[PDB]
Each structure stands twice: as C-alpha cells, then as structure tokens.
Amino acid sequence: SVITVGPYLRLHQCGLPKKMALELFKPFIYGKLELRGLATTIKAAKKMVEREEAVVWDILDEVIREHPVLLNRAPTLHRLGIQAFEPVLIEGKAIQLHPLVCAAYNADFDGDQMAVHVPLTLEAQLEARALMMSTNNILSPANGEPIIVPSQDVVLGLYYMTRDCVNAKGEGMVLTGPKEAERLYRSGLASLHARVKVRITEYEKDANGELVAKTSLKDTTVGRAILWMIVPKGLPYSIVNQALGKKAISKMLNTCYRILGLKPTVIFADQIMYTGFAYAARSGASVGIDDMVIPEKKHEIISEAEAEVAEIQEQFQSGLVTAGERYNKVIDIWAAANDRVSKAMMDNLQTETVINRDGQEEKQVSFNSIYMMADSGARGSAAQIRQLAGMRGLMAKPDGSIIETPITANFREGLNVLQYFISTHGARKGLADTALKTANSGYLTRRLVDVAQDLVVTEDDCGTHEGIMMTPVIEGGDVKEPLRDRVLGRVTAEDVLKPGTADILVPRNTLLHEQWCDLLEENSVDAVKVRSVVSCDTDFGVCAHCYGRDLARGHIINKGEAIGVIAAQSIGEPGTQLTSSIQVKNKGSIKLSNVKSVVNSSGKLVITSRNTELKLIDEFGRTKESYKVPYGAVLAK
Amino acid sequence: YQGETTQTLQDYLMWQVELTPFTDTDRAIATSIVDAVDDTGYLTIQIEDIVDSIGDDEIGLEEVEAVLKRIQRFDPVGVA
Amino acid sequence: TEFLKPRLVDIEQVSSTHAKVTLEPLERGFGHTLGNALRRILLSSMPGCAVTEVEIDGVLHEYSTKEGVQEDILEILLNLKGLAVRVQGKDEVILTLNKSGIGPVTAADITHDGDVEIVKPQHVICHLTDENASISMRIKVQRGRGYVPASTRIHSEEDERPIGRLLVDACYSPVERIAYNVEAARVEQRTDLDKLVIEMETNGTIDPEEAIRRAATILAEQLEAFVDLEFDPILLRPVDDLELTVRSANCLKAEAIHYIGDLVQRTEVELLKTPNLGKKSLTEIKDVLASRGLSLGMRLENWPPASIA
Amino acid sequence: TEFLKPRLVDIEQVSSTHAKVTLEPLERGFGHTLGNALRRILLSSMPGCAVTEVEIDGVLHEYSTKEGVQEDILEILLNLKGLAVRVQGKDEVILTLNKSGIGPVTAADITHDGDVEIVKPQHVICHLTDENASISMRIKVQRGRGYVPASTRVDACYSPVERIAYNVEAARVEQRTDLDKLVIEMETNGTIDPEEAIRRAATILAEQLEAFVDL
Amino acid sequence: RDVHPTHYGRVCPIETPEGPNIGLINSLSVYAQTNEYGFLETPYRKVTDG
Amino acid sequence: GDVISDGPEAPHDILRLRGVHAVTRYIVNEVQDVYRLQGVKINDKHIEVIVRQMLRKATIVNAGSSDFLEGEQVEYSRVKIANRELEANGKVGATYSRDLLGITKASLATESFISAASFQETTRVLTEAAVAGKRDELRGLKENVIVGRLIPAGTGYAYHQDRMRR
Amino acid sequence: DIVLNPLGVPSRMNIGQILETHLGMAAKGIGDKINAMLKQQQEVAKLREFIQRAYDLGADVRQKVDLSTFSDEEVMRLAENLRKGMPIATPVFDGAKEAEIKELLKLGDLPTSGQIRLYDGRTGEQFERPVTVGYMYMLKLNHLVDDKMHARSTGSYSLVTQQPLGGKAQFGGQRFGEMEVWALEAYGAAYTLQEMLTVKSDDVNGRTKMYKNIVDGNHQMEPGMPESFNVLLKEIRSLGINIELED
Amino acid sequence: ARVTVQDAVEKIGNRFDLVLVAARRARQMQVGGKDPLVPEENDKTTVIALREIEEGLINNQILDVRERQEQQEQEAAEL
Amino acid sequence: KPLVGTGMERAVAVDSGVTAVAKRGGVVQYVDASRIVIKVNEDEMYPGEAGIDIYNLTKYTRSNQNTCINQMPCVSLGEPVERGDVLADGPSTDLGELALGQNMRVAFMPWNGYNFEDSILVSERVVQEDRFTTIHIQELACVSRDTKLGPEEITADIPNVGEAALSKLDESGIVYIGAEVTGGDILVGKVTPKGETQLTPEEKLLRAIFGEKASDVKDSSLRVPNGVSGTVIDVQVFTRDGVEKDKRA
Ligand SMILES: [Mg+2]
Ligand SMILES: [Zn+2]
C-alpha cells in the first residue's frame, strides 16, 4: 500500500491499516479467539472474523502488540532496505513510515509503495526484533556515519532554532536556565533567534566510566538554550552553539552514540525529529517569488560579456584569429560571466542584511528563506539557487557541442522559446543517462554479490602478522581523505611507536575506536600497519580480528556474519548518483623524499632520479603537502 | 505461461481434521470419511462399511459415529 | 489581587447570515487565551440540524435523472445539503415538497410543519423545465453535532428497505467560519484591559448569543472534570445437561467436573486414566459431547464461578 | 446532544516538583484547546511570589566586584530569583542575609522570619571566599501577579511554572476511531506542586466563564 | 531517443513518456500539419524584404 | 616496476611485478578516487573484500604436489604447502604465484553445480556438470537457499558449525 | 484548503507553481471583491466600471475590453460567474509577468510579496515571518489507495509450482525477490529466510502443518523441501540428464 | 515494548546466539515448561525472554543446567 | 475552470467529443438533464423537412479507465445560441473550458511534518465539500447456458439460498435497478444442470419435500466479487436470437 508520513511515530514503530492487519495476522487471530473461548471451533472463528465483530479487533490488538512486522521498498540496495518496525493500528488504507529511517529506503512520499511481511515462526519473530529492528541499525553498513540523520523539513527547524539576528527582544539579558529560556520564548517576549547569555550545566564523563558535572555562563541564544534540553547528559554544550547545518547535526548523533550507547542516541535522535518539526512549523517558513533576488548588475555583465564576443567575432571577420581559438574564446568569455553573476547573487543573497542596532548599522547573514534552505542543507543546493536567480548556464547540441549562445535568462524571468528548446537536449539526455544508471547499478551489485557471497567471518583470530600500511592520500594541495577515516573501525597488525621508542601506545592487535584514534591524534604518527581482509591468514572466509569492526553498531564485528554480501551491497547502493609551476599554499619546511640530486652552476638544485616527492612539513611535524616533481627541475630550496 | 490455479472441494473438509484435535487414531477415521463423501455431500459407504476399510477392531462402530458427527458439525452444517 | 472579570457587551448585527459580538473586560493576555478556545469549540461543537434521508417520486438511485428537471438527481441531492432549517421540540421531522409547472422550486414550497424555520425562502433546490412535471419528494431533517458522512452510517445498518432513500451528508455545522481579534480596550477605570470582537459566520439557523454561550458552556464542563483529579465464552451449562446414558454420567461427577468448562480441555488419555470408566464409556462421552459442538481438547483461562463457592 | 467527559486514570510524578499527567478521552479538537488555554493561563499568570529587589553591602550597584563571592552582583542576582519563598497572610516581607565566613551562603544561612517559609534549605545563593567576606543585605519579595520583569519599574519570576507542554496523542474508545489523549507535563520551583497549580490555573479559566454559560 | 533541432515546431520537445521508452513517442505540435508525402509541416510567415 | 611510458597501469602488472599490497592500494585508491570525488563514502574494507575475491585463482611456478601451471585457489595450494612443510616430504613445497582475475571471471569459480545453474548460463553448466558426473554437497549459501534449508552464514551458522561433525 | 511544503520548489526547480499560486491569489482576490460588490447588490453601473478596470490592467495587450454589447442586462451574468474567481489566460511564453501580477494584486487588496499573516488553529498565536498563500490548481490522478492496498494471509496457490498468485492484485502476495533474499543474507536472519521460501509459500506440506500450529499457539516449523525444486528435478529429468539425491 | 535490544548483545556475544537463547527460552515459556524469571508487562513470550537476557539470569549456560536438572528430576520420579 | 489557464482549454474541450457541439443555432426548445431540443433558424436550415436539433446526452456511462462520463446542460432555457457552440458540458469540462480538476487555497509552510517531501496536508473542509470525490463504474458480466446436459437458466429460482438473496433480485431473476450491493451478494442468478441422476427411493423423498426447481441442478451464479461494492445503475441483456427472456429483457 502507499506510504505516508509518520511524524508522531517513535523510531521503533510504524503505521499499519486495520483492515489489512486483520487479514495479515488472521491465523493468529483464529487461535487467540478460540483460546479465550470467544469462538467454539475454527468455523465459528472465521465466521466471526468475516463478520468483523467488534470483539475481534481487540484480539488483534493483543496478537499485534509486541509482534514485529517487516517493511521494504520495491528496489532494495543496502541491507537497510528492509527494516522491521513495531505495528501500530491505524485507521485507513495507507501505510505510515517513520521519517528518520525514510532516508534508508530512499523512499519519496510522491506515491511509492511498501511491502509488509509477518515473521511467523518464533525464531523469525526474534530475528526481526534483534538484528532487523530500527534502533539496531542506525549506521549504514557502507559507512559508520548515521543513517538516521534528519533530512530537510526537520533540519530547517533546528537551523531556524539556532540563529542570531543582530538585535531582537531579550537582547543582552541573562536567564537562570533552559526552563526560563523556553518559558521566555513561549510567552511572546523573548525572540527565538536573539543574542543571550544563559546559565546551563554541561556534563562530561571524561573521568573513568563516570559522569562529572560542570557549570558556567555560556554565550548562546534562546533557541540554542531550548535545544539543549534535548541533548542527553554528558554531551558538551559546545555542540549546540552554531548555525546547526545538516552536517553538524550528524556528528552530534555519532558522538552521542559512541559515548552514551545505543538507547540515548535513539531517544535523542527521535526527540531531535519532534522538536525540529515543531519549531520548523512555528517558524512560519515559506518561499515567495521575491525571496529570490536577481543581481542589479546582471544586465551590465550580460552587455559586457556579449560585447567581448563582438570583438572575437570581428577578429574572425578580420582574419586575425581563427575558428579554433575564436570558438574557444567566446565560450570562455561567456562562462566567466556566469561565474561573475553567480558570485554577485551569492553576495546579494548572503551578507546583504543591513540592520540597525543601537547605533548606526551592522551586517550579518541574510534571513532570506530560500537562502536558509540552501544554507541549512535541508533541500536545494547553491547550484540550483544559481539557476533560479542568475543566468542558469549554457546548453549544448545532441552530440554535446556547447553552443556559443548561452542561456541569458533564468527561471525568475520568463524564458524565451529558444532557451527551452536548447535545454530540452540536456534535460532529455540527463533523464536517459540517469535512467540507465539504474540498470547499470543493479547489474554491478549483482555481479559483486555473485563473486563475494560465501565470504563470511569464519575464525575469530587467525594469528597473522601481515597487513597493509595505512597512510593518508595527501593529494595535491591538501589531503583528500585523512588517516582517521581510513583507520577508525579497524585493528592494528603491529605495535607502532611514539616519538620515543620502547613505549607501546597501541599493543599489537587492538580495535581502534575514538580512544586510540584521538590518541594517535595526540601524537604525530601518520602511518600504521592495519590488518586487512586481503591479508587474512585463515582459509575460507575472513576473521573478526582482521575485517575490523564497522557495522550498524560501533562494536567489533561478530562471528558468523556474511561480509561479502553487505560489502557488495554497500558498493552497489550509491550507483544511481553516478553520472604549470608548482608551489605550496601553506607555509612549511620543504622536504624531498627519496631523491638523488646534484648541484649546478654556480649553485642551485637539479633533480637526477625519476621519482621525486616534495613533502611539506610545517612546525607541527605532520607530513602534509605532496607535489610530484619531474626530472631535471630547478629547486630554489 | 500459466493455465493453472488451485481449487478446494473436500480439501476444505480436510482443513478441519488438521486443526481440530482428533488425536492421531481418530483423525485417520475422519480422513476415511471424506473420501466416501459424494459430490452431493452424502456418504456412499455404510457406517459399517467404513468400519471394514479401517480394518481395526478398536473402532467399535460407536467411535465412528463419534467422529462422523463431529465432521458433520463443521460447516457446511449437515454435510456427510 | 485577583480582580478581573469578563462580561458580554453589545451584540452588533450586520446581516442575517453573520454578525459580531464583543467582550469588554478581559485580563492581561487572557483575550487570546479564551479567544482561540472560543473559535475552536465554536467551530467543532455546534449543535444543529440538516437533511439526512431524501426520498423522491420515481427515482431509484442518485445517478439517474428524473424527467422534468435540468439538475441531475445527484445535483439535487447536493442542493438539499445546503438547506438551513431550525426545529424546536422535535429531534427529527419529515418535510414534504410538492409543486408543478415551469420555474425553479424554492425552499418555500415545502409543507409547513410544527417547527419549520426556512431562513432562505428563495433557495434553489432545482428548476422545473416542463409544464406537466411534478417532483413529489420527502425531505427528512435530523439533529446532530459535527460532521457525519453518509458512508460511515452503514455500520448501524438495520438496512434501508426503501430502494429510493438517498442518504446525504450531515453538515450539522451552523458555523462556516469564526474569526476573532483582540484590540486595546479603553474603559476608564485604569491603564489597560482588553476586549474580544468576533465576526462569527453563520448560515442563519443559529443565534450568536446561544452559540457563543453553549461553546463556553462546553469549555466550562471540560473544566469541571478537570479541576479535581464484555467477556462471555459461548456455552457454560451443566455437564448433566448433555444427558449422558445412565451410569456413565456419575463417573464424571466422581472427579467433580464443573459444567463443560473443564470438560472441554480434558485430554482423551486424561479421561482414560480416571478410575472406573473403561474405553466404552469414553466412546459414549465422545459421542454425546461431539454431537453438539467441539470434543475433548483446546484450552482456555479462568472461570466466573468457583468450586461450590 | 451528549458530550464526552474525560476520565483521568493516571498521575505519574517525576521526583517531587515534576509531574506528568495524562487525560482522555476528548472530543476531536478538544485536546489542543484545553492544553493551549491551560498552558497560557499557567505560563503568563500564576499567583506566587518572587524577588523584586535586593540591597547591596559592599557597593550600592548591580555591577561591581566581590570579594567574598567571586560572582558579580548580576551573577548572584540570578540565584536570588531562583529562591522559592512562600508567605503567610503577611502581604509583604523584607528578609536579611546574616552570615559570613569561608563557607558559602545558602538559603538556610538567611534569617528565620516567622511567617516566611523557604522550601529549599539546600539552595545556593552564592559561595563565600576567604577570611571575613562580610556579606549582609536585605531582600524584598513582593506579591507574585502574572510576571513582572525588571524593565517594568531585580527580575522577579512569579509564576511557579518552569515549563508548560501539552503533547496530544492518539486515543481509542472502543468503536470510536480518533480521540485526543491530552498529556500535560509541568514542573514547578517548589512553592507549590504542579497538581494544585493546575487546579487553580484551570479554576481561573472556569471563573472567566462565570458570566456567560447557563448550567 | 534524443531530440533533434528539426523537432522544432513539429515534434513536442517536452511532452514524452518517461520510462523504458524515452523520445520514442514524443507528441505533435499545436499548429503542426501532415505533409503531402511522409514528412511534417511547420507553419511559417513569409517575410519578403522588410 | 617504473615509468617506461605514460598512461594507466594494468592491474596484472601491478599484481605480479609489484605485489599484492600494491595492487590492492591501486584498486581501492582508484575506485575511491571515483566514489570519493562524487561525495560517496565507502569504507575501504568492502572494496578490500571485493579485491580479495579477485585473487583466488593462482598459477604455480613449481612442483612437488600437482602440475606446474595449474591455476587453482590460493587457499587450495596454501593448505597444501602449509601441510607440506612439516612431516610429509621434508620440504617439497611448491611456490605458487597468485594470479589476477576479473569479477565475472572469478565468480565463474564455484564448487557448487546447483549454484552454477543460477548466475551463469544454465544450459552450459547442466551439460558440463552432467557429463562430468559432478556431485554438489550443498554447503555454500545459494544452493542451501534454493534447497530450502538454513543459510550457513547468519544465525544458521550455529546449525552448520555443529552439523559439520554430525 | 491545502498546506504544502516550501522546500519542494527550490529543489525541483519548478518556479511556475510559485507564480500560478501568486496570480491565483490575485485572480481569486478580484472575484472575492466582485462577490462582495454583488453581495451588497449595487447598481449595474458600479460593477460595470470595476469590470472595465479588471480587464484593463497594465498597459497594452490585447484586451478588447467590455461595454461593446449592452452593459446592463447583457453583462450581468458575467458577474455571477466571476463571484467565485476570475478566469485568466496565461499563454505559454506570452503569459503574465512580475509587475503584471503585482499590478493585478493592487486591484482588490493584496501585498506585493503574495504572503500574509497566518494563525495556528491549535494555538491562536501568530506564525513568525510571512506565509505564501494563494489559489493553486490541484490534480487528482487515478492512483487511488483503495485500488492499490492489498493483504494476503492464505490464498489459493499455483498448480504446477505451488506458489502464491499473480500480484498485489488478487489473490496473491508480494513477490519477495532475490534482492530481498540478499538483504536477508546480509542480516544474520536465517529462520526468516527459511520460512520465507519454505513454509510461507513454496512447501506443499509445510504450509498446512504450520497453519495447524499458528492457531494452536505454538510458533514453529517443520520445513521439508520446497516443491518447485522437486519440479525442477523432473524438468531436468525430462532431458537426457539424470539428477538424483544422494547420501 | 522492546525498543533497543542492545542490552542483550551487551551481555551475550555474537548477537545471533542471543536469538537462539531467547528463542529456546521463549519456547520453554510459550510451550510451558517454566515461568518468567521477570514480571510480565503484558509483553509477548518473545519480549519476556529478552527481559531475562538483560537481567543475566537466563543465557545459554543456565538453560543447559536447567534442562539437565529436570532430566535428573524425571529419573527421580520413582516415588 | 482553472483560475490560471493558457486559453487553450476551450480549444481542447471543444476539439474532442467530450463536449456537446451544435450543428446549427437558434433558441432552445426543451432543455432537460437528459435531452436538449433546439429550434433551428431559417438561414442555416435546409428547405426540406424543416426540422429541429435533437440532442441526447449520455448519462452516467462507463469508460475504459472505470471512470464516469456524464453530460451537464449549460444552457438556461429559451436562449439564442450560435452554431459551433457548446450546448452542454461533459466530464471535466466547465462551460466550454477544459477543467482537469479543481483549484483551492494553498499555503507553503512546514506544518510539523505532515508535508514532508511531496506529502500533502488537506483540510477537512475539502473532503466535506465533496469536490475531489470521483465516481467509479465497473462492468460485471455473466453469460453461459448451452451445456451438453442442457441449457443453463438465469435465476428465476436459485436453490441453496434463503429469502434475503432472492429479495433484492427481480421476479425475472436479474438484480433490481439500484441496491446496496457489497461483498458476496448475487447480481444475477445462474443455474446449470447435471441430469438423469438415478432417482432411487431416496431422491423421490428429496424431490418431494423441497423439490425446488426441481432442484437437480447446481448453482452457477455470478456473485458480487468479495471486497468490492457499489450500486447497480444500468443493466443490459443480449439474448441470442431464438431464445426469449421472461420479463426484464
Ligand atoms: Mg520518488
Ligand atoms: Zn585474519
């Protein structure tokens, strides 16, 4: 049946139709009826459930209460594509899904349908609530990051909650605690987003397995002081002071889970959903046609960039330039205009707020709606805001040859008959390609699960000393992915060393969690030999002390879990999204790694060997910026 | 590529004997009755003739009446 | 100090449909607190009456068309859903409509009954296109509260034996909207007290005073409760009722069998083990017990009676 | 025309000053109106008492340095507001703070007045530093009426209510489909428990209707 | 499946089914007309000089 | 290994001429160069298991157990040389060479003849298996999924670890 | 009438639904005034002038305004049809524009922003910031839930391979695919998949022997072997191939 | 209800053997050989077993000795 | 009609037969919810036979989508009309303008999360006013007879059912026009023979006390499909030439 919103549901429950549930559980309802003596034999029992006598709906309420069910979408990619919830009888023909797990199924509410299943045998009833439940998978098997992270309407709420205008009611005042903060907001006196200073209590468990208290006067806003009551216990107050983007709301949940355990992150995430929808409504957020402002300087930019193509065209008429360099000149001088207008509207929709407090004036980030929608990470991106205000871009022909006559207009101004027809190509080829990547993605994950499958954790510890050497990629200017992300969730193959040796910070095979990892962050160590699934000693499958930890849970992987299926699934799920002179930006100490050289006349450096890696070492000691230097260079250092 | 689907006639009556406890020994007696049920719904065998089919001396001819009535009482009422 | 009180002030009538009311003496911020409750309860709970069962002369179902009217039978039914009516002593009344000849059928053509208030005499039910045609119908009016669709009333059943009865939707809503505003009230007195001005919209079947009265009445009742703070297994009859042979009935009483309630869940071997029974008596109890429903088995819980207690 | 009267089956209180109460059944649309109305009558006007003003010993002002309590005069001006003080038939009182030493100044260290009752002996007004740390002052708590801020004339928080929330949930009465389950969650400052505060707060709403409804 | 510049004024560039067949259907134009032989016609206005 | 010309590098040359710990870094780092530039977060471990499966078949360079050139499971030979060091022959152990196969080429290696009727052409598998007189013992998942018994992966592992002796 | 999400528009990049609403607020507004002006039953002349102004609006084209025919008895019906709303034609690329929409909003009474103040009916307070309101055209497709939603406990099965039937549509039940089996393989769920492809559907005896359990209250299974595998054996056995079951 | 079963895996490892223990125990209840070691909340025999898993008074190690002791009780039935 | 259209709605609704066009014009004679009769003027009318314009509007008929197609007359009465104009309005056509649906008041705001993604929040006023409601028509047909054991008769007697089923079936055995029909009801009674079952002493007793049709015969009936409901509106019968029907036909 069709799926609708569950905003009133707890993370562990979902809605189900009454008349559908009467049929689904019918064999249970029979026995439960004749067990209470409501019906003599089976024939009278079904004769009652056919009449839908009012006594049987309560019997159903009994057998459906703690008995879990199974939902699922039409496409299934990652293992989280099927999640079991607890049934809640709802009057209607439509099924209701929880919004937090909605990001898992990739379920839009635009008319998709969901399948329900009943775990009949007792062992299945247990496996549905144990490993198939919601709370038990909060972390995608693809990456240990939260899969429950609020999507759009809710993060619009927390974003509107944490903000500060330069001036508002309750400015520069002190309150005793959060209860007086919300007590101040619900009275129509204090402003939601306003500059305040309130006293709160931020606990920290940084002692050994024991929560320690603390208190202070923290600089914050009314909205952030209200948002703190949601944060459980030992989390610090430094997490709730910020604009609260859809990103910064993630690390909050991840930290909560890896600190307080599973339950506080569950009830906590749910509470975040409730308050976020709450104040997301009370915010009165909307979008107008005037909420998208066009730069006043656009027409002049259009006339200038269109005035350069007249020069290049006249040069093509005068014989100076040629078609090869003029076709490439007009496209560049036209694209620079799109960049200019992008920066113009990004300036005029961002910091343009001109607002007065006490004395003359001050400027801040704008309260414009659509801007906040893009800034909070709720829905829409700065690319789309660019197309919706300034010139949307340039379009090509069926082959993909970019036309020298870009799209000057936008969606705010009426498009002409040419621009729509020229955009039809890009639209149609986009739809066709993105429609093809579905069959490509399934065709991929199918092969990948075909080759892996039977690979399953078999032995706990195979006792091997072999493992890969993990290092950050350090691409170009700065590292693309750091050591922490390629390390966390795994187990070392050998003890590494501090600056002083003979001291063992990591003793041979040990899981690296937030403790050992941040401990390595205390030191400068950039490399460790991790145990890898490819280096595993044991035969016929992998080992938990090799495969590492990462799963829906932050604990080390258990024995007898099939890794290949979930790995291939994790690769196949994100298949739809698929389509000079060197210097250093930051200061450091230039260090040449594994090079032979020689001094030229009268003296300077010239490279002899082939492989040359120029590594930047700043005053910290981290090996930082790497530029591969060719053969026979001239080094001024 | 399908010309086929399921149907239930006396199979419906057999749904009775599996769920309703006859224990083991009487269920076989009830299964011997449903075969004798005509399309019209009445037994072709004599009540002593099904007694011959079971080939047991523990039926007593009284026990067969005990089970024959109980399968009569499942809908359709009056059957067999 | 505890001195603040509301009381009613002038009622401004504008039209027959809608009107305005005002409340002079409200305390600090209390005009908004009690106002939204007045809008809510005034909209939701608004006792009234509307059309329920419409019978027509020759019309079997609502999807046909009666010769002599330009509106489809369904459209006439929906036109009856907007008829304003006010009764007094009857909870339901059966009206009667008769008319002939060309021209629209006004809401005045009904037969006047003991309580008939038609506040819309010119209301359009449907036009008559033919010189000789007459729609002889019976419009039914009942009293209710809230919104009661015609589909949800089929659970009561009792059927409807008439094949021509068209169940329409129950409006039961004298109020199509209510809007309030609180402005600074100058009554001197003193610095500030506040006032409420309600523009409440009515179809015309309800007086503003009675409405805005009963709403606050229901509020007060909920506040009253606020201030201070079937199971029958089918057959239990005596085991003696089943009339078991002669001697076999005593054997069950020897173990003190209470009715059939414990006799059902007794296993075939459990009865075998009872002293002085025999397999033949077991075939007898199986026969007589199995004559009526069930047989030895299944299971249940508790009992209303105790053992001779 | 008959109406649904609610039956409250549960009062579950958290610790002492906190209470979570459930209510049902309600007519459709009747949960949010009772919860909202009662919420506003509880929040914006609750009879009570709080701290209108306090004299200063070392200085005359609200901004200056102490010296025996490291917190400023504004930081201590907070803890004063969070001091729950109930009074007998006496309509006004000015208490004085008599204590000194290296140990802090609690709500027990104050003077014991006859008709004044402090519900928190454990309350902390401020923490006293070394040697004498001479600290004495006078604090006047006027009648709580609604909420009167400081800009209207020490912030006095009168209404005992520290929180007001009504979370409506689904409710079922047999064949009835949709009902409102009205759950009120409220915690006070200790002057009065949430139960009776909800009682009188509702009773004000009842008295606002005294001129209109006929029984 | 893709769109051709000749579709202008004849084959609707926008309205087409979405699914296994994209651009294999498309649609007609408001003013479009069937050509004499097999082709499509588009209405145009004759501009002689200015 | 070195730059003898520009352009990409075939994973076969990186596996043989360089090593396993090299080719794995090349594969996972390249595919992560794709997914990561798109904003996709895939932990390296998954790609490491998919790479691990591509290394199964290995061609021997030596003798003392089986023929010289046999491409065979690295586990099949590893158990034989690990069993051939102590006892047996004093040391006859044949050094192998771990080879490099594609995804569809590696998935072609399946002991199960029933699971061989699924993701590959059924006619060919039934013909070759039938004429070869092969015997499928079930074991691995797909066959046990088709045959309607517990899966030797998840909770059902507790069934197959205890049943192996029985 | 309908509350919709703001965040849908800036993502989907459909801004027409933002204009069709705004102009709607104008197009309805005029009507809301016309009705009111007819609700006061004025003389034929005042409504005549106001309707003249309504079809004039911004300078140019191409209006061809009223008063051509009789403006009393002939144009009176043009009022009754306008008291609901004011039908307006917005040609594809020839349609309205910003200052046109605002200029028509000035006519009855409306702000340029196309946004007003709203009050929550559950509270009575005010929503901070404005709210974009208007009259948008909604379309009801035929996907209706009543035709879609389905439930199957025990239906008729297939003959050749004993299996549930042809769809969500009667009488069958949802097809639990190979990808769903992969999702179950990922999780450690074993009896779940076992009952899925054995006792739930495929097995001939296991379904009934299970049904006699579910009603009894003992949740267990006697799985046996799927029947369609027993079919595959005979289908291979129809060739020159022999396939047996050993051990 | 049972929201998060984390307390269970937090005691017994492997997280799958948890299903076998709570399932076997839930069998001991649903088909009655025994009684709940923890009060019933009206929850089903599925949840009571997990409640026993959390409290640590039911696991794979205890049920063995329970079963064996009842075996020796049946050998002690001579009377 | 759409508040914001393109102006092409008239060019759509008229260009298809969903509307009611005019062969000619002049004052309408008889306007009803069923038929429309026009008096043709002289300049358009042909000399012979004179004549008037007779129009019969299709009322509540099926469609390929199981929808309802129906015509609503838009002319008041006694009114001049011009040739090439719409006399009536079919489904989804408002006075010549194409109306695919309805419009209403919309507001873009987060509501506490019932508007998430494309989910839509609708006021109770909408479902109360009965605007988005639709009318579905389904065609359930029954034909058999002609068995090697003799023909099958349609109802007129249907043994094995009591009084209630036969109550809502007409004396002919067809269902009455209009009804409350749901679940397993009997739309048309359908019988079928088996024949010359040896009577034996027993069947004479069977044929004596009940005797029914005489009911020697099975029950072939078409019944309402379970989980489906509606109201019977129109019934068609096609009787193969050479075989009469009692009344209904
Ligand atoms: Mg979608
Ligand atoms: Zn290993």
PDB file of C-alpha atoms and ligand atoms in Angstrom, chain A residues 73 106-112, chain G residues 12, ligand 1:
ATOM      1  CA  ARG A  73      10.636  -0.894  -0.691  1.00  0.00           C
ATOM      2  CA  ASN A 106      15.338   6.163  -0.384  1.00  0.00           C
ATOM      3  CA  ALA A 107      11.548   6.476  -0.177  1.00  0.00           C
ATOM      4  CA  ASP A 108       9.937   9.570  -1.599  1.00  0.00           C
ATOM      5  CA  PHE A 109       6.380  10.261  -0.450  1.00  0.00           C
ATOM      6  CA  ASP A 110       5.350  11.079  -4.055  1.00  0.00           C
ATOM      7  CA  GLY A 111       3.424   7.789  -4.398  1.00  0.00           C
ATOM      8  CA  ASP A 112       5.851   4.919  -3.764  1.00  0.00           C
TER       9      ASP A 112
ATOM     10  CA  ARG G  12      12.661  20.656  -8.018  1.00  0.00           C
TER      11      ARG G  12
HETATM   12 MG    MG J   1      10.379   9.055  -5.960  1.00  0.00          MG
END
